[PDB]
Design a protein around this ligand. Structure first.
Ligand SMILES: [Cl-]
Ligand SMILES: [Cl-]
Ligand SMILES: [Cl-]
Ligand SMILES: [Cl-]
Ligand SMILES: [Cl-]
Ligand SMILES: [Cl-]
Ligand SMILES: [Cl-]
Ligand SMILES: [Cl-]
Ligand SMILES: [Cl-]
Ligand SMILES: [Cl-]
Ligand SMILES: [Cl-]
Ligand SMILES: [Cl-]
Ligand SMILES: [Cl-]
Ligand SMILES: [Cl-]
Ligand SMILES: [Cl-]
Ligand SMILES: [Cl-]
Ligand SMILES: [Cl-]
Ligand SMILES: [Cl-]
Ligand SMILES: [Cl-]
Ligand SMILES: [Cl-]
Ligand SMILES: [Cl-]
Ligand SMILES: [Cl-]
Ligand SMILES: [Cl-]
Ligand SMILES: [Cl-]
Ligand SMILES: [Cl-]
Ligand SMILES: [Cl-]
Ligand SMILES: [Cl-]
Ligand SMILES: [Cl-]
Ligand SMILES: [Cl-]
Ligand SMILES: [Cl-]
Ligand SMILES: [Cl-]
Ligand SMILES: [Cl-]
Ligand SMILES: [Cl-]
Ligand SMILES: [Cl-]
Ligand SMILES: [Cl-]
Ligand SMILES: [Cl-]
Ligand SMILES: [Cl-]
Ligand SMILES: [Cl-]
Ligand SMILES: [Cl-]
Ligand SMILES: [Cl-]
Ligand SMILES: [Cl-]
Ligand SMILES: [Cl-]
Ligand SMILES: [Fe+2]
Ligand SMILES: [Fe+2]
Ligand SMILES: [Fe+2]
Ligand SMILES: [Fe+2]
Ligand SMILES: [Fe+2]
Ligand SMILES: [Fe+2]
Ligand SMILES: [Fe+2]
Ligand SMILES: [Fe+2]
Ligand SMILES: [Fe+2]
Ligand SMILES: [Mg+2]
Ligand SMILES: [Mg+2]
Ligand SMILES: [Mg+2]
Ligand SMILES: [Mg+2]
Ligand SMILES: [Mg+2]
Ligand SMILES: [Mg+2]
Ligand SMILES: [Mg+2]
Ligand SMILES: [Mg+2]
Ligand SMILES: [Mg+2]
Ligand SMILES: [Mg+2]
Ligand SMILES: [Mg+2]
Ligand SMILES: [Mg+2]
Ligand SMILES: [Mg+2]
Ligand SMILES: [Mg+2]
Ligand SMILES: [Mg+2]
Ligand SMILES: [Mg+2]
Ligand SMILES: [Mg+2]
Ligand SMILES: [Mg+2]
Ligand SMILES: [Mg+2]
Ligand SMILES: [Mg+2]
Ligand SMILES: [Mg+2]
Ligand SMILES: [Mg+2]
Ligand SMILES: [Mg+2]
Ligand SMILES: [Mg+2]
Ligand SMILES: [Mg+2]
Ligand SMILES: [Mg+2]
Ligand SMILES: [Mg+2]
Ligand SMILES: [Mg+2]
Ligand SMILES: [Mg+2]
Ligand SMILES: [Mg+2]
Ligand SMILES: [Mg+2]
Ligand SMILES: [Mg+2]
Ligand SMILES: [Mg+2]
Ligand SMILES: [Mg+2]
Ligand SMILES: [Mg+2]
Lengths: 174, 174, 174, 174
């Protein structure tokens, strides 16, 4: 047993490792989207930079779980980071739709971890999730939903001018 | 009788209370428009912020009538603030059309109050309306009319790209 | 269904709308208190400004619920804002007593919303209430209770000198 | 006829001269109040300074009428400035009551001048009164009424401690 361990259930420790893997998976998916939008035959560089920055965010999310695990006296156990579901992402609308689904998948895993922490009466883990993960998740989901609404308004997928305009006005210029 | 009261007719006092209520009603309508444009399936955030700021303006307009009432020795009497006419506002053009009508309704009430103040020979109240309300009303009506002309030019309601562009270029970025 | 909606029960959505209305109601009550203490025959201007600032706080509380509703994919539904219970507020002690009761009513509604969110297993909503509402509520209740104790010490309602002194020393000079 | 004169009725010219005299009379009354509160057996120096500053205000009000008269091509005609109604002013409450009555007398004369200017179709004179006199009059009347309410609350005339406290907290320290 770790000398620091107190009120930390084995099931929660394992679920934190799984959650860490999922954050790394999400990071990798966003990296793939970055590379796609940087292609010379796609060439939407503000969209590309948006996904690059989200990839970095998710890796920070993973590292925070590593630190958490050690703070509680659990042990980090790593697994393969699965490659993303797709090799090419279609266009800005398809990518944003995939990002929305990914963020909801991550959110569901966080909510499931909260239910486990609640069942094991671990208020520190509940607070960690509520204070460091759940709200930023809701914010990201809202932002991406707002983008999807605007991409549809702009006539995606068919309206190339609309897609061009989204890249200039909706995402930060990089 | 209030010790400060001088040349302040009961009818004017009552009309000031009614006008206060109408300003609060206008504020509430604009709040509703803000919330609508902030919806994830609407997502025109500069339009939303435009309406939020107008909601704050109208509440300031109401508070100025409260202060006026007390300065003259009248007594503030509040009534329910009626909910807005609609729960959803269609799109930027429909909302701006409703805003134009609302500002003209408020203007008509101000003009009617001026006619009452004139009939009761209350130059202080006439000056207050002319100096604090009537010109800003004309300016707001002109601004909203200009917006409606541009929304029609941009092909509203059908042209989603036009609506997107209005939000980026016509209203302040928030 | 909203594309962003996840783990957000219809009952919670409705309760958030009701809570929004209650915040607006509280704002309006405080506005009435402001106007009362600004009367020439009341004339306690620091007390008036205290209530004006609380009125603004409560409207900010309402707007935060609007934003919350949209972030979760719920839909803002507005109802009439009922006029305050009284047209005149007696004196500083009676007003502070009414304010204490109002803040406890608002607190009870927040606590009831927390119980609903708990029952529906909505940790995001629980966190929102705990992080943005519950503590500031306890602070406001404590502050008003402290004021009531001091108003009684100062001999309210009978001791006009005491009431005058409270306005100079207990509330911020405006 | 003056070369500048246009749309300026003889009756208005005469009424402006009378109004000038009344402003000078008001100034002189306030000077008397200043001197009274500076007496060693009265000794309320912030109250004294309040009245001194109002005396200066009223003399500025008179000089503005002189300038107005000349701008319109009328001719300033001066009369004796009558000494104030009283040689001694009792206490802060009695003085403030007399000041309220004086400000209402001045206000009534301004309103009567506005009615004359209206009857003679002189919009410049109406605007001058509305823009330079009527609102500041309402503000002064409200301020003095508020003071009277507080002096009564403080137990004037009998409560000397109350009178002392008013001088420290209600009027600017000089
Ligand atoms: Cl343990
Ligand atoms: Cl334990
Ligand atoms: Cl265990
Ligand atoms: Cl594991
Ligand atoms: Cl596998
Ligand atoms: Cl693929
Ligand atoms: Cl597509
Ligand atoms: Cl997914
Ligand atoms: Cl968070
Ligand atoms: Cl641009
Ligand atoms: Cl956008
Ligand atoms: Cl009257
Ligand atoms: Cl009159
Ligand atoms: Cl009347
Ligand atoms: Cl009324
Ligand atoms: Cl009704
Ligand atoms: Cl509707
Ligand atoms: Cl339309
Ligand atoms: Cl309307
Ligand atoms: Cl104006
Ligand atoms: Cl425009
Ligand atoms: Cl849901
Ligand atoms: Cl869930
Ligand atoms: Cl549901
Ligand atoms: Cl509802
Ligand atoms: Cl009802
Ligand atoms: Cl009442
Ligand atoms: Cl009481
Ligand atoms: Cl209550
Ligand atoms: Cl809080
Ligand atoms: Cl002090
Ligand atoms: Cl206190
Ligand atoms: Cl002439
Ligand atoms: Cl003419
Ligand atoms: Cl003439
Ligand atoms: Cl003359
Ligand atoms: Cl004489
Ligand atoms: Cl005398
Ligand atoms: Cl007396
Ligand atoms: Cl007089
Ligand atoms: Cl003025
Ligand atoms: Cl005072
Ligand atoms: Fe993440
Ligand atoms: Fe994410
Ligand atoms: Fe542009
Ligand atoms: Fe308004
Ligand atoms: Fe308006
Ligand atoms: Fe509140
Ligand atoms: Fe409150
Ligand atoms: Fe004057
Ligand atoms: Fe005066
Ligand atoms: Mg060991
Ligand atoms: Mg284990
Ligand atoms: Mg996994
Ligand atoms: Mg594989
Ligand atoms: Mg909890
Ligand atoms: Mg917390
Ligand atoms: Mg937080
Ligand atoms: Mg985030
Ligand atoms: Mg996240
Ligand atoms: Mg946004
Ligand atoms: Mg009275
Ligand atoms: Mg009446
Ligand atoms: Mg009405
Ligand atoms: Mg109704
Ligand atoms: Mg007329
Ligand atoms: Mg103007
Ligand atoms: Mg305006
Ligand atoms: Mg207006
Ligand atoms: Mg313009
Ligand atoms: Mg949809
Ligand atoms: Mg529902
Ligand atoms: Mg309710
Ligand atoms: Mg009712
Ligand atoms: Mg906190
Ligand atoms: Mg608070
Ligand atoms: Mg609160
Ligand atoms: Mg305290
Ligand atoms: Mg000549
Ligand atoms: Mg003449
Ligand atoms: Mg005279
Ligand atoms: Mg004489
Ligand atoms: Mg003015
Ligand atoms: Mg003045
Ligand atoms: Mg004056
Ligand atoms: Mg004041």
């Amino acid at each position: 047993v770790s000398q620091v361990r107190q009120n930390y259930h084995s099931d929660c420790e394992a679920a934190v490792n799984r959650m860490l893997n999922l954050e790394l998976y999400a990071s990798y998916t966003y990296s793939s989207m970055y590379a796609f939008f940087d292609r010379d035959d796609v060439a939407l560089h503000n969209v590309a930079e948006f996904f690059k920055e989200h990839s970095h965010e998710e890796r920070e999310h993973a590292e925070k779980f590593m630190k958490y695990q050690n703070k509680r006296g659990g042990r980090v156990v790593l697994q393969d980071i699965k490659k993303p579901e797709r090799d090419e992402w279609g266009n800005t609308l398809e990518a944003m739709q995939a990002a929305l689904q990914l963020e909801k998948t991550v959110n569901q895993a966080l909510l499931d971890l909260h239910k486990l922490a609640t069942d094991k009466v671990d208020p520190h883990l509940c607070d960690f999730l509520e204070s460091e993960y759940l709200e930023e998740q809701v914010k990201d989901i809202k932002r991406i939903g707002d983008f999807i609404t605007n991409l549809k308004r702009l006539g995606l997928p068919e309206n190339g001018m609309g897609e061009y305009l989204f890249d200039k006005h909706s995402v930060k210029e990089s």
